């Protein structure tokens, strides 16, 4: 199981965060009640060439509230690597009817944000 969407990549040194009311990827199969979730940070490192580990740019993946690797965390719960996003008017209920993605059945939806959304500096898709 995986995120329904492709990642955001962090080039700066701050964690992801969105203005209140923006941040949820567009998904034409979801309703206005579903527009709420969290982004989870994913780290990666490689043997850097000098024999030492090299940290790569963190990526951040979105999961609907109540799904994914932190399916049990309630909205706004404070956990390192977890940041919360919601469209105004989204219901605060688990989205188990959307679930997570099986890569052996569906590729990721290309991540895109609703118009007028400001990504923090150093974050790109």
Ligand X SMILES: O=c1ccn([C@@H]2O[C@H](COP(=O)(O)O)[C@@H](O)[C@H]2O)c(=O)[nH]1
Distance CA 112, CA 104 (A): 22
Distance CA 36, CA 75 (A): 9
- What is the footprint of ligand X within residues 32-61 (CB under 6 A)? 40, 42, 61
Least Å from the CB of residue 88 to ligand X? 26
Between vectors from CA 42 to CA 66 and to CA 55, what angle results, nearest 5°? 165
Q: How many residues interact with ligand X (rule CB under 6 A)?
A: 7
3-state secondary structure of 34: helix
Residue 41 is assigned to a ligand binding site:
no
In 3D space, the residue among 68, 56, 73, 123 whose CA is nearest the CA of residue 98 turns out to be 68
Between 61 and 64, whose beta carbon lies closer to ligand X?
Answer: 61
Between 22 and 100, whose beta carbon lies closer to ligand X?
Answer: 100
Confirm or reject binding of residue 3 to ligand X (CB under 6 A).
Answer: yes
Bind-site residues for RNA: 44, 59, 101
Residues at the site binding ligand X, with contacts judged by CB under 6 A: 2-3, 40, 42, 61, 103, 108
């Amino acid at each position: 199981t995986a995120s329904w969407f492709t990642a955001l990549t962090q080039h700066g040194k701050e964690d992801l965060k969105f203005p209140r009311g923006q941040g949820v990827p567009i998904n034409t199969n979801s309703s206005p009640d579903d527009q709420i979730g969290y982004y989870r940070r994913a780290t990666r490192r490689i043997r850097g060439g000098d024999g030492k580990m090299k940290d790569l740019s963190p990526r951040w993946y979105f999961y609907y509230l109540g799904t994914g690797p932190e399916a049990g965390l309630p909205y706004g719960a404070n956990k390192d690597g977890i940041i919360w996003v919601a469209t105004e008017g989204a219901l605060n209920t688990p989205k188990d009817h959307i679930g997570t993605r099986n890569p052996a059945n569906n590729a990721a939806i290309v991540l895109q944000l609703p118009q007028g959304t400001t990504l923090p500096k150093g974050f790109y898709a």
